Amino acid sequence: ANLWERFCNWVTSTDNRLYVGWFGVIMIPTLLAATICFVIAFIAAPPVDIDGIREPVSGSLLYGNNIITGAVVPSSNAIGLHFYPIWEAASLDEWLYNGGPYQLIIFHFLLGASCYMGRQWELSYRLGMRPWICVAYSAPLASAFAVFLIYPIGQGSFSDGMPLGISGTFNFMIVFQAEHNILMHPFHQLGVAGVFGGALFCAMHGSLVTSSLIRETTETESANYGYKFGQEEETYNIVAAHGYFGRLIFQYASFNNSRSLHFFLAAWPVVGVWFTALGISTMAFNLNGFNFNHSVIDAKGNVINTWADIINRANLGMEVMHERNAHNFPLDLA
Amino acid sequence: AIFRFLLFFQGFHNWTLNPFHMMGVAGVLGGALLCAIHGATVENTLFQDGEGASTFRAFNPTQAEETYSMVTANRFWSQIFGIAFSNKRWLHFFMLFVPVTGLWMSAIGVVGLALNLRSYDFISQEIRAAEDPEFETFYTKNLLLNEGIRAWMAPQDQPHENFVFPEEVLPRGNAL
Amino acid sequence: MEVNQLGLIATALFVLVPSVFLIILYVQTESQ
């Protein structure tokens, strides 16, 4: 065969310890670029003027952060949505001041993780599998596009994208709550149901298969030695697990069909996270959570506060303090 | 009411900064991750045990045999992510362990908050911040937000205190 | 930064001690 066909066979080869694949050919350089840049900047990047008001925020370890407080800081608001590669800067020092590394990291990373998703499909095809694992991963992927791409698009600036840092993530969440009442938005309420419930059904399924492991071991060995990799037989009695769990609630609240059961496990958190990713993506366009402020009034017209009004008091405190030097006019419209 | 409690915990306890809550998040998000990834893996390594397009009917609750391929799943994740489960018992024990351990850790952190025994601050950052008006991090920025939550929500949230705060003492940035 | 001097020894031993515990158990498992 010819060089190119040799090359194609290597790329799509199923004997590589890690699968490469055509999606892998974009994924590997973009992820490497993003990881390398993220690691150097987390450790050594100088302070970034995130809000465009010549007020640099120090995000890196050498400039006085620890693991919890450091971040790679979003790019300057003066830049907005403009593209700011290294070669648009007059110098690396300028690029660092204005938060260039944020743009480089997130763009290489969205690309690479999108190709991650594709790669999940690609290998399932070479292995003879069903294709839809990659659909499950689209829920985490979509959420990452929401906080790094969609929300900055709707608000006009990557400076309002999520910072790459532990405390920066919290800053992002608090200011989002002030500006959108995401707690009061049904899609975030679906996200919570999605992950609480996903943890629930995770503990349930683990604990129920674990409870109905067939005796294959003595009391001195890990029961994990009772399962052998590739064995044909199942190592737990699902009839016993259904029998236990059917009586804990009632017989039809419980699954008798492993396939239904595992589709349920896949579907529930994935849909939840789709909805919450959709929630950040549409609050990107200022369609915010319910507003019940002063919704209750008495016969005279006095306001009868409800818990929604107490939330609004917290929200107001976030609103008036966030980015405290950045607003010259009374409305924070983006 | 519960949302109000969330926000209370942010502005008064700085609870997002608490490593016990952080472990809790990891175990809950981790649990949901395990739920989705396992359910999806089994659904996409099923054996063809029937001739229909709806694959749910090709499973008999008393059959002896595995309904999906541990071996192919294993190879897929080994080659996609680098490592894979190979032991079905360890897998399902790991699924109980993660979210259970997550919630227990968060409970410990709230016991501390019973006592206002918080992880509110990093002392080294406060010392430098006091001395150096140019030192800003995301930690100091979040503390300004908590200071807003406390003073703006306290009079209505805790009315038995009869807090009266004139406009002029309320923390506010410019314009807002 | 005016961090806590004992932080270093606390982090050092936090890692060292339990890690060594596992290594000892693992190595004496392989040699049988």
């Binding site: 370890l61 693991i67 | 490592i83 894979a84 | 930064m1 961090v3």
Partner: peptide, 30 residues
């Protein structure tokens, strides 16, 4: 000293990844 500690621990984790993937117990079918 604190920067070095954070970076040391992070460095070790990445080493662990390498051994965990390329020097794993190989899964075998019996």
């Amino acid at each position: 000293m604190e920067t070095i500690t954070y970076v040391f621990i992070f460095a070790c984790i990445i080493a662990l990844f390498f051994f965990a993937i390329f020097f794993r117990e190989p899964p075998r079918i019996t």
